[PDB]
Structures are given as C-alpha cells and as structure tokens.
Design a protein around this ligand. Structure first.
Ligand SMILES: Nc1nc2c(ncn2[C@@H]2O[C@H](COP(=O)(O)OP(=O)(O)OP(=O)(O)O)[C@@H](O)[C@H]2O)c(=O)[nH]1
Ligand SMILES: Nc1nc2c(ncn2[C@@H]2O[C@H](COP(=O)(O)OP(=O)(O)OP(=O)(O)O)[C@@H](O)[C@H]2O)c(=O)[nH]1
Ligand SMILES: Nc1nc2c(ncn2[C@@H]2O[C@H](COP(=O)(O)OP(=O)(O)O)[C@@H](O)[C@H]2O)c(=O)[nH]1
Ligand SMILES: Nc1nc2c(ncn2[C@@H]2O[C@H](COP(=O)(O)OP(=O)(O)O)[C@@H](O)[C@H]2O)c(=O)[nH]1
Ligand SMILES: [Mg+2]
Ligand SMILES: [Mg+2]
Lengths: 38, 430, 67, 430, 97, 430, 430
C-alpha cells in the first residue's frame, strides 16, 4: 500500500488521489483479487 | 558561528562605541592591547595567533574624535584602516552629509563592511549607533542604511538612536534633521530604540545620586543595556533569545517598531548591599514610569508587547510569580487584542562591573524592551517644534543650497502625520 | 549501417558474431577502395624520429660506402 | 526486539532529552562513558530497546537531535552524559527561525529536513522489529513546532502502520514567555491531530504548581521540571524493558485508551511525590499511591479533571505487589467517583504491573487518562488566537514567507471543530 | 488491476471528468501524464516515444520492414525473422458504417 | 611466484609511489633500512611479490622511477623509506617537458626511453613467473602523460599476454592547476584505451570531498590523498600476498569485470573511513562495511554512480568473517537497487575474502565497479578540449615539435566514439 | 643541475639587479663578501673553496653606476671582469646603442655569456632586465636578444621590461625608442612582463603608506616578485612549476606574450599582525584591479590564462576553494574558448624579509602572472603619443644622423597596428 502511494506521489498524482481514497482503491482491488483467486 | 557587526557614526555614536567597547573587552577578559593574558566570537575575530580584532567600524567626517581614539590606550586594538575619517564636518547640516560630502566617503565604508562580512559565516545582523540631532550622524546613518537595505536585503539592522529631549536641547536646528532622519529610517530599519538624554539624566540624579554627570556616565548605562541585550548570544542560558526572534514578538505591524527601554537595578555600592534585590522588586522597579530610559509616560498609553531580559541566578518560577503581579495591577493596562504580551529570557552570567564606574556588582538584573502606544507624544512635540519654524521657512536656505529640493521637507511631515494616525488607529479597541 | 547488417542478419545466431566481425572487416577494404590508403585495415614527433633514425642509418650506410 | 528510536527538536525538546537519557542511563547502569557497570542481570537483557551496540563494548543511544540553531546542541554536549550521543546524528542550520512558524515549516525547515530524514531512515531501516517513534518538542516555539510537525507528517507518510508518540508542551496563558505563542500553537495543533497516534500535553504552569505545593521546594528550576517529565516518560515504557505480571506495550495502550481516532490527547501524572522532610513520615502502600494518582493537583496539566468526565484511564504500577489489591482499589476508585466517569462504557480503567521498581523507590505509578476536561486548554488558546488575529497583528511576518490567512482560517475552524466534537461525547448518554 | 481502477477513479471527478469517454481514454491519460512526468524528470523517454524499439540492436531495420509491410500488405523480405499479425484500432466518426 | 614489478613516472606518480611503498613496507614489517622486523610468519612467505633479495639479508623493491627532470627523485630519496630504492633504477633527463605532451612523447621522451626500457627488460626477464605490471601516472602533466603512455605501448608490444595495470589521475575541471590540461588529457586517453588491460581513474576533487566530508579533518594535504590512494592500491593485491577463503588474482578480476575489451575504466573506493572522534562510536560489521562501500560519496571519482547503471561490481573483503553473511549482503544490496544494475547480465557482483586484515584494522573492503556513469568525465574533458581547440589556442607549442592537428582530430573522434559506445550498452535491453 | 643567467643592462636594469641580488644573497644565507659563515646552484656557482659567484652580468655604457657598484659593500662578490662598462653614454638615443657604440661592446658581452654558459650543465634559460625608455637600455637589450636568438636558438628568454607610465614621464622622447624596442623584442622574446612605475607608486602609497617613495622601494617589490617566480626551482614544493612550463600554459599564440603581474599581500609590520592573512583574502587581493603591477584596468578586457604562485604553509584544498569563488564572481570573466584558465603552484618556503625594508614577515603570499586582453590600451596610448610627434618628423634628425634609415620608424608602427588588430581578433567569441 505505501509503495503504491509512493508511485502516486512520484508521478505528481497525489493532488487527484488522497491517502484515504488510495487505501479504499487498494481495499476494493484486494477484495476482488481474493474473490477471483478463491 | 554567530556574529554581529556594530556601526558607529558621528560624535555621539563614536563616544558610545568607546563606552561599549571597554565593557565588552572587560567582560571577555581581553586586555586593552587586544591580547589575552569560545564566547568571544560574537563580537571579535581570531587572527591566528594572539590579538583579537573587534567587528566594528568607526565613521566621522570631523577628525578630532578619531584622532583621540587613535592615541588613547586602545590604539593597538582597532584595525588601523577601519577608523574611516573625513576632512570637513557637515556642521549640523543634514543635506551636507546626505548629498555633498557623505557620498564620497560612503564607498569606503561599504567596502569595509563587505570585507568584514565575508569573514563572518553566521551573521545574525547589524547594529548601528548615531545621535540623530546632528548633520553627519543622521545623514550618514540614513545613507548607510539605504545602501545596506539593498546590498544585503533581509539581514536585520538595529538602531540605537538618541532623539532630542522635550525641552533640553544643545542645537537650535535639530528638529529639522531629526524629522528627516526619522523619515529615512522609518522604512529602512527593523528596530529603533529611544535614548533621549533627559530621562537618563534624571535616572542618574535620582538613583546614582550624581549631581554633576557627564556624557561618559550616560554612555556606560547605554553600554550596559547593549550588553544585557546581546548576552544571550554568547553565554549559556535556560531560556535563550536571538536577535531574529524579535520582529515576531515585539513588532505587530511593519510600520510600528519604535520602542523605549528601561533597566534595573541602578544603585551605588554605598547602599546596594543593605537591601536584598529580590527579583520581584527589581521587576517592579523596571516597570516604574520614572525609570524609563526615554522621557515618555507609559501611563498615557497602552502596552503592545513587552520583551524583558534577566541575567544572573534568577529562577523561572520567580519570574512567573512576578509577571502575574504586574498583570494584576490596575495602573498598567495592555491592548485588547493582546492577551499575553510578555517574552521572557533568562541568562546565567551576572552583569560585569567596570572599575572606577558608577554601578556596583549585583547578582540579578533585568532589562526590558517594551513597545507601547504612548510613544506618539515625542513625535507630536517634534512635529510641533518643526512646524513653528517651517511656517516662516527659517534656516531653509542652509539646506536648499546643499542640493536638497524644496519639497523634501513636506513629505517627511506627511509621513509623520501618517505615523501618528497609524498609532491612534492601532490603539483603539475592537 | 545498412546493406551489410541485412547480410549479417541472414547468417544463423552461432556464426553471427563471426559474420559481424567479417562485416566490420569488409568495412575495411571498402574504405580503402573508397579512399586510397592501404594502412586503415586494423585497429612532429613521428616524423622527426623517423627522420633521425633514417639519417643515422644513412650515415652508417655512408660508412658502408666508406667501407 | 520491538524497540523505538528517539527524535527531539528545538531547545525545549533538547533539554527534555538531556535529562530523559540521563535517567535511562542511570536506570540501566550505563556510565557517562558508555560502559556498563550495573548490578542486576535484568539490566542488560532488553537494552536493545533504546541503546545500540558498537565495537569496544560501549553503548550509544539511537537518538536524533535537530535544531535550526547550533547553540543548544553545542551546550548539551558539554553536560553530563553528553558524550553518549553520536556526533553524526547532530544536524543543524546556520540561521534559525526566530519563533516564526512559517520560517521553520516552509522556507528554512523544508530544505534542511532532507539531511535529518536521511539519518532517520538509516536508523529505522536497520533495527530488528520497529515498535515506533517518540517525539519531544514544544508548541511555544517556531522552529520546533514547525519542523517537528512537518517531520511527523513525513514519517507517517512512509511508516503508516507503526505507532507514533509525541510529548508536546503547549503554551499556557499564565506563564507566557513569547508574544507569538498563540499563532504557532494553533497552527501546530491543526497538523498534530491528523498524524500523531498519541499525544501527551505538558504545561510549565502545572509543573511549577506541583513543585511548589507537593514537593514544597523553595526555588524550582528547569532541571526539576525536566526531571519530572523524564520520570513520567520513563514510566510509560518500563514494562516493555522489564518482566512483569501483565506486560503491556505502547500499542496495547493505544488500543485501550483511544475510543475514536481523533481523541488521542492525554494528560499524565506521576506518583509518589513527597517532600524531603516528609519522605520518612509516609508509608508506601497501594492505597497511598492510588489516592495521589487520581489527585487533581497531581496532573501534569493545569486542566481540572473534575470539570469533566473520564472517557478512559490507565495505570502502570511498578514494583512487586499483589494484583488483587490493585484490582479492588481500581474498582473502589471507580465506584466512589461514578459521577466523573462516562456511563456508556463500563470498566474504563486499565491496569498493568511491572516487577522492577525505579532505582531508589519501592513502588511507583504512571497515570495516563483520556478525559473530556482537556477542552479548556484549546478553548483558551483559541480565545487568545482570535483576540490577536482579528486585528491582523504580527501577521505580516508569517505572510511574508508564502503563507496566507486562509491557512489560519482553516486551522481555527478545524481546532474549534475538534473542541466541539471532543465535548460532544461528554453530554452523550445511553 | 489497481492501475485500471486508479485511472477510472481519478478521471471520474471534476475538473477532468472523462466518464463520457471509454475507460481506455482515462487509462491512456494516466500513461500520457506518466510520459510527461518521465520527460520532465529529465530522464530518458525513448521507450515511450519509440514503441517499435521493442527489440535489441535491430530497431531501425524492424522500422523499415514494418513500413514496407504496411505500405504494401505483404512485402517479401530476403532476410526477415518472422511476420506477426498485429491489430491496430482506430476510432472513426461514421454514421451507420 | 606470480609477482609484479612497479613502474612510476612523473611527479604525481613518484609522490603516489613514495607512500605506496611506505604502506607496503609497514604492512610487511620492513624497516626503512631494509631489515625485516615483523611479528608473524605470514609476513615473509610471499614477500617475493614486490621485494627482491640481495646479499646481507636486506630487501629492495623492484620499482623503476623515471622523470624528465631530476628534482622529484632527488627529493623522494631524502624522505622516509627513500633508501630502499636501488640507485641504479633512477633514470632522468636534464631538460624536462614543461607540461607539453609533444615534448614528452616525440622529441625528448623518445630518446631517453631506451635507458629505462633496458632496466625494465632486466627486471622482467629475471623474475620467477611474471604476473604483470602496474603503472602510476597523471594525465594532467606533459612528461608523465606522454612518456608513460608511450612506455605502455612499448611494453605491450613485447609482452602481449601479460596483464597491465594503470592508476591514472585525470584533470578535473573543478580543481585546475594547469591551463593545458585538456590537450594532454585527450591525447593520452586516445593511446590509453588501445593498450592498457585495466585502468583506474582517480580525481583530486573527489579526494578533497572525501577528506572534508567523511574524515572531517580541517586541513587536507597531498599526504592524505596519497595515503588514501595507497590504501586503495594495496587492497587490490592483498589476497595475492596472503591466504584466504577465495583467492583471486588480478587476472581473475580482469576476466570477471571486463565484458568487452574496450570497457576497462573503473572507479574505486575504500571502506571503512571514519573520523578520529567517531572511531570509537562505530562498530565494524559486514552490513556497516557494505553500506559505506556502495555509498556514492565514497567513490574516488566525482562521477555520480546513481546517474548510470553498473555493468558489474567487485569487492575484496579483508579480515576473518563468515562467507554466508557476505553473500547474503551482496544479494541484498543487489535486490534493493535493481534499478541501478543492468538487467541482461544476472549476478554481476564478485566477492573475495582474505583472512589477513590491514595493520590496525579488523575489517576492510576494496571496491572496484565498472559503471556506465564514467561517461560524464570524458564528456566534460572533451567539452573543454573542443572549446579550446576551435580557436587553435596554445596549438603552436605542440605543432612546433612535429605534431599536427590531424592527430588531434583523430584523438577527439576516437574519444567521442568511446563515449558513445560506452553508453550504448546503458540503453540496451533484453 | 638547474641554472639560469640574468642579464642587467642600463641604469634601471642595474639598479633593479642590485635590488634582487641583496635579496638572493640574504635568502641563501650568503654574506655580502660571498662567503658562507644544495639550493644555491640555481643562481650561484661554487669556486671549489669558499666564495660563491653570481651567474649575472652587468652592462652599461655610462660608467657611474658600475663604479658605484664596484666600491660598495658588494665589491668582493661579483667577478671583476663581468661588469662590462663603456665610456660614452647613448644619451636616450636608440640609434646610438643599436648602431654606433653598442656594437663595439656587444662582442665582450657575448664572450662573457659563452664563458658563463659553458659552466652550466642544465641551463633552464635567460633572464634580462632593462628600462625601455632609454637609449642604451633598449638598444643593447634589442641587440643582445637578437644575437642570443641565433647563437643559442630554442633556449627560453624572459624580459622584465619597464614601460613608461600613461601620463607620468621623465624623458620627452621615450615613446620613439619604446616603440622601436617593442618592435625588436616582439619577435625575439618568449615572455615580457609589464612594470610601469605609476602603478607601483600607487601600490606603495595605498598599502605601504609611504608618501615619499624612491626607486629602491620599487626595486625591492620587483625583486620580491622575481624571487617568488623562481622559488620553485630551488625549494621543495607540493606542486612545482618550471620556466619551460610557461609557453604551454600562458601563451595561446606565438605573437601574444605580454602579460601583467600582481603581488599580495603588501603590508607593513605596524598593522600586519592584526589580521589573519588567510589564503582566500590574499587571493582576493591579488585579483583586485587596483593591485595590478602595471597601470592597466583588467575590467576592460577578458582574461586568457592565469598562472599564479603560492608559497608558505598553504594547502591545495584551500586554493581550490578560492579558485571556485573567483570563478563565481560576475566582474571577472574569462574568454569563451578557455574553460579552465588557472595554473597553480605551491611552495613551502615563506618569503624572506630584507632588514630595514618595507615589507614585514608573513607565512603566506601569492604572486600571479596573468595574460589578459586588456593590455592593448598601453599599446594604443603609446601609439597615439608616437603619432603626434612623428606627424611633424620631430626629433628624427637625432636618429637619422646615427645611421638609422628613414623608413625604420614606419614598420614599427605597422607592427604595432598588426598587434592591436591581433588582440582584437583573439578576444571575440566564436
Ligand atoms: N547620549 C549622548 N548624546 C550625545 C553625545 N554627544 C553628542 N550627543 C547628542 O548629539 C547631538 C548632536 O549630534 P552630535 O553627535 O553631537 O554631532 P554629529 O552627530 O557628529 O553631527 P555633526 O554636528 O555634523 O558633527 C546633540 O544634540 C547631543 O544631544 C554623547 O556623548 N552622549
Ligand atoms: N622602475 C625603475 N625605473 C627606472 C629606474 N631608473 C630609471 N628608470 C626608468 O628608465 C627610464 C630611462 O632609462 P634609464 O634606465 O634611466 O637610462 P638607460 O636605460 O641607461 O638609457 P640611457 O639614458 O642612454 O643611459 C626612465 O623613464 C625611468 O622611468 C629605477 O631605478 N627603477
Ligand atoms: N521544561 C523546560 N521547558 C523549557 C526549557 N527551556 C525552555 N522551555 C520552554 O520552552 C518555551 C520556549 O520554547 P523555544 O525555546 O522558543 O523553542 P524553540 O523555538 O524550538 O527553540 C518556553 O515557554 C519555556 O517554557 C527547559 O529547559 N525545560
Ligand atoms: N595526489 C597527489 N597529486 C598531486 C601531487 N602533486 C601533484 N599532483 C597533481 O598532479 C597534477 C600536476 O601534474 P604534474 O606534476 O605536472 O605531472 P608531471 O608533468 O608528470 O610532472 C596536479 O593537477 C596535481 O593535482 C601529490 O603529491 N599528490
Ligand atoms: Mg561632530
Ligand atoms: Mg644611463
């Protein structure tokens, strides 16, 4: 999660995506990845 | 790695610089020859082996005072070619020292300033001393401040100007150049401290019990105030204060930076030890209106912010217990938009005594720098004095014939009117 | 470059290094053919030293004539 | 394992650390030369929590010292136990902030912080299992309250899952030493709530009150306030360095004392505290410790805890004692004071026991309680802030370095919202 | 999958709401922005600018072969490694094509 | 067996050797009188690598000293350990080159070199099994950069299968002491690539930076730079003179660090390096050595290694340590920095362990890495060369001794081709 | 095994030769009798037992100065028959000393030169001193240079000529012979250094604070410059420079070899020790336009190359740190086609003091030899002075009647025009 947010910061996209929005995106992707694996 | 450079211009400036430079040399153990028989670095510089050189420059167009300096006991201390001297005096004419003879000397002074600044690595700021009621002092101070404000920019400059007394005066034309110099340093100096002679005469008479004082006694008190202000940079303390930590605490607005000082205790050895000199009584004496270092009444106006320095064995809890008592009193009232107005500094080194001087040795002392709304009275009375003679254009021909324009007098009057209106506008409650 | 890289690309991966070395070498005669200097087919003072050596040798040869 | 690193900033934080590390070294028997000379085996088992190991068998603290001026760190090095600190960890600037929050957070603090962040990253990446960070700084100064809080955000951005401690001294209106205290206090509280996992407020006024009333010593100094703060600091992590009946790391306290993520401002207190002349009269028993622990005057803050209701409470007992007595006394202190405990969360007191008492004492207690009475401090800070801001006093100093009034308005609004939503739960009923 | 969700979310908000376009437009805009930042960082961009630079050493030869394969659909090469069928997609604004 | 001879030229090379041989003699316990006084048996087993044996039991280095002026060798003889050198090996001219490359390579250097080649041939024909030659010279001087490089070609023509080392100091544009540095640097780099099997660039600017930042000593001198270069030089051949877990001669490094025959320009660095005051704080561990080894500021060149990608790397550990830790740390330093390592050659770090540490140190590391970041030095050298050559400045001095501008054009073109083809592999991908 | 021969011709040449020969004898410990009560070999020769003989020859047609030399305290030092003297003076007529009376004396001087040269084995080059604005000086200097250029060929010759001041002049006809001598030495001398008297007068007045200087004070400064230039040949140094290493570093093109010198520090013992004389401040003073040893403004032109010598305890890193500062300044700009323009030399021997002289003893000094484009102004003003009188053919009859042709004046004018065009052509950027 913090490494992906560092990608967002390094590409000057942190103004478009908050930390909380980033965590929510990661959570939603994690959920669907886990459902697909199962 | 912290440094400060002091500028002395004019007869009064040089005579107070001598006074502060005996005191610093005595306080750091340096003999008058400059030889010791890591705190010195603020005012001095090491030459590699032996002597120390002050970070000071002396300026004057009239050579008598510099020649007196270069033959006294301190001839070996100062660098021979930083005592810049002229040939012809400005003779109390402001236009002379700003337009005619000061311009040819100012370049050498600026070269010396650069040569001193390149040596420093942690330059805190500049100090300048000048008696305002004189030609060369006010004019060269104005020109130097104007050059420094653009050569260096954001570096802090402090001005210890000596304004004329309300009624006591030595010249007859000093209101003109006082007003012009106030115009010049209003937009060019970060701090200005009031130092008129009459208040200090009264202080000496009442406390020191001297009935025939001379200028040296006044200059020693001023030197003690300077030492108390700059002690925090070169001695260990429980609550330190730096020069750059002033415009954030004493200057509410960029225009308002004229404040008046006080010192306590002032007492002679003949009756000093009979009383205990507690911190409460000295901090009460410091706030007494009769102990102001400038002849102004603080009871006639509000306070804006008080910055007050202690040194010695004072404990912070005793300081707080005394600030509370002052907040309690009904005769001292602060401005509405300032709930807390005190900045406190505590240092451990007690004040040093100069042999053969007036003050005795004590373990506790307090120096206050207070910004108050009552300062507008000196501006009003100087303005009234100026208007009386400017109505008939008296003494103007001595200024118009030295290159200054006719309209230059009016705009200084307008700026003083603006300052007086600003002081009234700030002091009203919301 | 061109025409010699398309010819090197027609040679199998095992001999392609050798064909690339031959193509660089074939670049070797071509420059001479293009230009005319038989000393570009591998990898004051020079002239002076050569001249001096020749002169000393010439003197020795002169001594041989002398012989 | 589960160790933490120490980071301190500003003069006040450096002076707090200069006694905290002395207390820790005396507890673990480490001489000022870094050589162990302790008596008990347990003194070395968990020394990796605070100390690193180097060649030659000596120990070095993993502390990072930062300030915008070199004086304070040049002074702390000459003090006792000053040689333990690694010279590489000293980072400083050449200018200072002058108690201006903008300078220490936007212009000067931004460029310097890269070097200190480099050594911070070096220290954290290396350690066995990180537990977290603890921060000591003052909210009454510019460089501290700016650089420390920006460093908090930078650390939180890189280690979102670790725990973060902050011991923050807020400027009380009683003992005021700086006139611009409300501005940088209000600006700092805005950023501190968003990133700090735990915050512990400490007031100089409460420390003076404690020293004058409980210890009854004549002349308090900063050394006594620092010693009390250091004892309180050490008491929190004692069970993480020593065995006990119920070990409880910092994360366990974080779970049990913070009901909602924005309510993490605690006030603390240490017991026992007795005068020199009465240290023989008293007998150390669990009832005697718990009656002094919940005493209102014993809190390290001027906030009056019987003006509100505790959301939760914690106690960290030290020494060997029976658990049944501790539990029954905790129940009794909660049955006799049901009016001051919120009713919709039952059993809101946490207890822990550590078998290793402080050196020289047989029993000790550290108290950390989350109460609704803390609203009064933010109320008075905001009151002074809005009294000073309505006239735009001293605003130009901040606005000249890229800051604007909008960030002041947002900070005031967020602070008032925090004040309101902190008391929202005080009137909440089940 | 995160990059697809990220592109779809960022460009779903004002001021740059691209929800009226295909989700590929939001994803392309992320790559265009990444290209712009990569160019700005004063770091090499050859992999972004030259898509045919996929293979070591023979990039110019492959570019010339691709031009010949496109100019006339199956240009016979004397010495080329392999023909790969690729798909290009263009969007055309045509009413009922 | 497998020994090497030492050949040095110019003033800079002579000063480097004057410390290299002192370091070697101190390592092997040889007194300045040539008498062994060592403590350990291993100090004598492989002394034939650098020292010859003469009657009377004393040892003499197999070094050859050459210069076009006699002053430097007349001065090095009076220094410590100056008597070890055989007087017969001293060869010098009576004129000098005056920093002119043409004079030291075409007119004067050509006639003198026969005598030095005679003694070089005498030394090489005699020795048991030749390993190779190592050359120390400077590219900023005329006689050195001319005669040394011509001697390189002459030696290579006669011993094509032996290995050849060159430690070359290139003129940096920051600290410039000669105006004609670009000409003889560019001319020398042209010849150096064609014949030297290994080349190691060293810059005075990087040495000053290291001395000022890592060692933090106040006044660097040429003795400190020479000592660092000497330690780095000794570290390379340590395992060839002492037993170890994985012996690795110079030829093994040549095989593993040079992918293509024209890419043999390395930059080196030595660890550990600590200040006098912090030598007690640090603890010597393999992680501590490897973190300093890959540090960018630790490189002996101003080239920034994070501006490019390493083609390969090498490390020569010294002291007794576990191999598992070394291998895992090498893997970790390569997994955490995958962006700075070229991807089409996996496992591109070579390691070696020698059980004999330096005298006074328990662990030491010598680092030799072939990186693409070295292009920046040739870029700036060629930039200055083409800035000066376009006006034909100082060209007549070179053209008056049989040289022409065509050899300048060819040298510039070949150097630019080297620069281009060295970075060609930086953008190469698999 | 390194030697140099100095030639002194004319009254000014002999009077500066005396000045340099007290200094050399004092610096090498040789008493005025020539007896000591291996560095001497550069200037002296050993006679087998006892005294030393200078490698110098004194020339003049007018016998007064030589007779004064042969009766002073130095009568025993010089060889009796190397003080060649004439009978009839040239009387400021150039044609006399080049065509009439100098030819009969030049053969003896050439015989003496051969007899001195056969003794030397490592002859570095020749030095020559001559005041240009005189008949015998300029004429005999021209004739000797022309004979030496063909007798010896490639040996280097250095000329320390003293050109007339811009406005201050002692003769009325000196432009004619100055222009003719510049014509003669333009194609015959490898280095020419500017030495006009007015600049050195200003230096003495400003720094040495002498209001009534004589020629001896000027000659002592010139002698100090010569000693600083030639120190590197006879003392050990970290960075040596030879005479032959000049045309490769300061002379971009064969025509351009006129450069102007400067020296620092210049200070009296009365105020020397009050300041530290760091390397940075002395290297700043050396580049000041007011401290040029020739009355030319460097701000009016570009720099081409700067060769500057240090001596004392200076460290190379401090030199580099000061070269960087000078490159930083915006008032000093170098030519486009020269990226680096500094050649630095460092020597260990501090400058020696002459008893009863002006300069004090210091541990650090710097001497710079700088080639700049601004030198064309002196040529332009000398040309303008020449044209005014050559328009009316004034004073020409004094030259035509001494064997010189009418057209000889024009071609010198054409060569000066060519030189001025060349200086303009070089200074334009590409
Ligand atoms: N406090 C104090 N004030 C002084 C002293 N000497 C002069 N003054 C004041 O300076 C005012 C006049 O300026 P001066 O300093 O005397 O003379 P100046 O500044 O050099 O100006 P010129 O007259 O042109 O030389 C007088 O009104 C005095 O009040 C002094 O020694 N101490
Ligand atoms: N710097 C310096 N210049 C001198 C000195 N003596 C003479 N000159 C200069 O020499 C110029 C004239 O040449 P001189 O050296 O005096 O006489 P000369 O060279 O022997 O030529 P003659 O007149 O024929 O004897 C004058 O313009 C002076 O400026 C001296 O002692 N020091
Ligand atoms: N406990 C304690 N508090 C201190 C000490 N020194 C200063 N303070 C407090 O710190 C406040 C001033 O903070 P300051 O020094 O300006 O912080 P800085 O701006 O980061 O240097 C004052 O109100 C004091 O109450 C000390 O030694 N101990
Ligand atoms: N490390 C080191 N470098 C030196 C020393 N002396 C000179 N140099 C460097 O060598 C360069 C000059 O080389 P030079 O003496 O002219 O070489 P030469 O022409 O062969 O005699 C300068 O740029 C210095 O940086 C020394 O004692 N140690
Ligand atoms: Mg006066
Ligand atoms: Mg004469």
């Amino acid at each position: 999660i913090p490494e992906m947010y560092r990608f967002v910061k390094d590409y000057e996209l942190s103004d478009k995506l908050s930390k909380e929005e980033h965590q929510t995106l990661v959570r939603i992707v994690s959920q669907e990845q886990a459902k697909k694996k199962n | 790695m912290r440094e400060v450079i002091s500028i002395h211009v004019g007869q009064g400036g040089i005579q107070v610089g001598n006074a502060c430079w005996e005191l610093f040399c005595l306080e750091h153990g340096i003999q008058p020859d400059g030889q010791m028989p890591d705190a010195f670095n603020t005012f001095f510089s090491e030459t590699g082996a032996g002597k120390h050189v002050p970070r000071a420059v002396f300026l004057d167009l009239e050579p008598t005072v510099i020649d007196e300096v270069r033959t006294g006991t301190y001839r070996q201390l100062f660098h021979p070619e930083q005592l810049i001297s002229g040939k012809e005096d400005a003779a109390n004419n402001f236009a002379r020292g700003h337009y005619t003879i000061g311009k040819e000397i100012v370049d050498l002074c600026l070269d010396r300033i650069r040569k001193l600044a390149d040596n420093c690595t942690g330059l805190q700021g500049f100090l300048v001393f000048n008696s305002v009621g004189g030609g060369t002092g006010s004019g060269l101070g104005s020109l130097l401040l104007e050059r420094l404000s653009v050569d260096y920019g954001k570096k802090s400059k402090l001005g210890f100007t000596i304004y004329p007394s309300p009624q006591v005066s030595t010249a007859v034309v000093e209101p003109y150049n006082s007003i012009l110099s106030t115009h010049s340093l209003l937009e060019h100096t970060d701090v200005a401290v009031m130092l008129d002679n009459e208040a200090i005469y009264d202080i000496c008479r009442r406390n020191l019990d001297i009935e025939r004082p001379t200028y040296t006694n006044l200059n020693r008190l001023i030197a003690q105030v300077i030492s108390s202000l700059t002690a925090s940079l070169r001695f260990d303390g429980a609550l330190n204060v730096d020069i750059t930590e002033f415009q954030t605490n004493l200057v509410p607005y960029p225009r308002i930076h004229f404040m008046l000082s006080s010192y306590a205790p002032i007492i002679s050895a003949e009756k000093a030890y009979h009383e205990q000199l507690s911190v409460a009584e000295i901090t009460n004496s410091a706030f007494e209106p009769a102990n102001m270092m400038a002849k102004c009444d603080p009871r006639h106006g509000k306070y804006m912010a008080c910055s007050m320095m202690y040194r010695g064995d004072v404990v912070p809890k005793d300081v707080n217990a005394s600030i509370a008592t002052i907040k309690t009193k009904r005769t001292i009232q602060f401005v509405d938009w300032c709930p807390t107005g005190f900045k406190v500094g505590i240092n451990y080194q007690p004040p040093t005594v100069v042999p053969g001087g007036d003050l005795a040795k004590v373990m506790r002392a307090v120096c206050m720098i207070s910004n108050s709304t009552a300062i507008a009275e000196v501006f009003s009375r100087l303005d009234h004095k100026f208007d009386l003679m400017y109505a008939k254009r008296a003494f103007v021909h001595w200024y118009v014939g030295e290159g200054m324009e006719e309209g230059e007098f009016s705009e200084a009057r307008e700026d003083l009117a603006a300052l007086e209106k600003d002081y009234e506008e700030v002091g009203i409650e919301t | 470059d061109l025409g010699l890289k398309l010819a090197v690309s027609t040679i199998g991966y095992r001999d392609r290094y050798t064909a690339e070395q031959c193509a660089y070498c074939l670049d070797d005669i071509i420059k001479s053919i293009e230009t005319g200097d038989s000393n570009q087919a591998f990898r004051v003072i020079k002239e002076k030293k050569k001249e001096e050596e020749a002169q000393e040798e010439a003197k020795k040869k002169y001594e041989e004539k002398r012989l | 394992m589960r160790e933490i690193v120490h980071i301190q900033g500003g003069q006040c934080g450096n002076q707090i650390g200069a006694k905290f590390w002395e207390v820790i070294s005396d507890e673990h028997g480490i001489d000022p030369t870094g050589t162990y000379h302790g008596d008990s085996d347990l003194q070395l088992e968990r020394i990796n929590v605070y100390y690193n190991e180097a060649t030659g068998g000596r120990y070095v603290p993993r502390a990072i010292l930062m300030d915008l001026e070199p004086g304070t760190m040049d002074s702390v090095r000459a003090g006792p136990f000053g040689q333990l600190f690694r010279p590489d960890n000293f980072v400083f600037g050449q200018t200072g902030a002058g108690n201006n929050w903008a300078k220490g957070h936007y212009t000067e603090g931004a460029e310097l912080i890269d070097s200190v962040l480099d050594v911070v990253r070096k220290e954290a990446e290396g350690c066995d299992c990180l537990q977290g960070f603890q921060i000591t700084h003052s909210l009454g100064g510019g460089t501290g309250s700016g650089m420390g809080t920006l460093l908090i955000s930078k650390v939180r951005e890189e280690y979102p899952d670790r725990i973060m401690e902050t011991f923050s001294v807020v400027p009380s209106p009683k003992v005021s030493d700086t006139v611009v205290e409300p501005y940088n206090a209000t600006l700092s509280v805005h950023q501190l709530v968003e990133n700090a996992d735990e915050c512990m407020v400490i007031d100089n006024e409460a420390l003076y009150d404690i020293c004058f009333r409980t210890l009854k010593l004549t002349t308090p100094t900063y050394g006594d306030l620092n010693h009390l703060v250091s004892a309180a600091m050490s008491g929190v992590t004692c069970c993480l360095r020593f065995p006990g009946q119920l070990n409880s790391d910092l994360r366990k306290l974080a779970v049990n004392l913070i009901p909602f993520p924005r309510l993490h401002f605690f006030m603390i207190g240490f017991a026992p505290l007795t005068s020199r002349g009465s240290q023989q009269y008293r007998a150390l028993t669990v009832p005697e410790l718990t009656q002094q622990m919940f005493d209102a005057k014993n809190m390290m803050c001027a906030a009056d805890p019987r003006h509100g209701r505790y959301l939760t409470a914690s106690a960290l007992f030290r020494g060997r004692m029976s658990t049944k007595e501790v539990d029954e006394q905790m129940l009794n202190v909660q049955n006799k004071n049901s009016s001051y405990f919120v009713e919709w969360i039952p059993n809101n007191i946490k207890s822990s026991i550590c078998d290793i008492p402080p050196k020289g004492l047989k029993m000790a207690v550290t108290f950390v309680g989350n109460s609704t009475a803390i609203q009064e401090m933010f109320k008075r800070v905001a009151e002074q802030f809005t009294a000073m801001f309505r006239r735009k006093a001293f605003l130009h100093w901040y606005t000249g370095e890229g800051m604007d009034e909008m960030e002041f308005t947002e900070a005031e609004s967020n602070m008032n919202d925090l004040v309101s939503e902190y008391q929202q739960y005080q009137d909440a009923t089940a | 999958d995160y990059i697809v969700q990220f592109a779809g979310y960022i460009y779903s908000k004002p001021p740059e709401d691209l929800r009226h376009l295909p989700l590929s437009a939001s994803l392309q805009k992320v790559f265009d922005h990444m290209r712009e930042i990569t160019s700005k960082k004063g770091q090499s961009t050859a992999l972004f600018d030259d898509y045919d630079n996929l293979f070591f050493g023979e990039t110019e030869v492959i570019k010339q072969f691709n031009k010949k394969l496109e100019e006339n659909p199956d240009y016979p090469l004397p010495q080329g490694y392999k023909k790969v069928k690729d798909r290009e997609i263009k969007f055309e604004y045509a009413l009922d094509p």
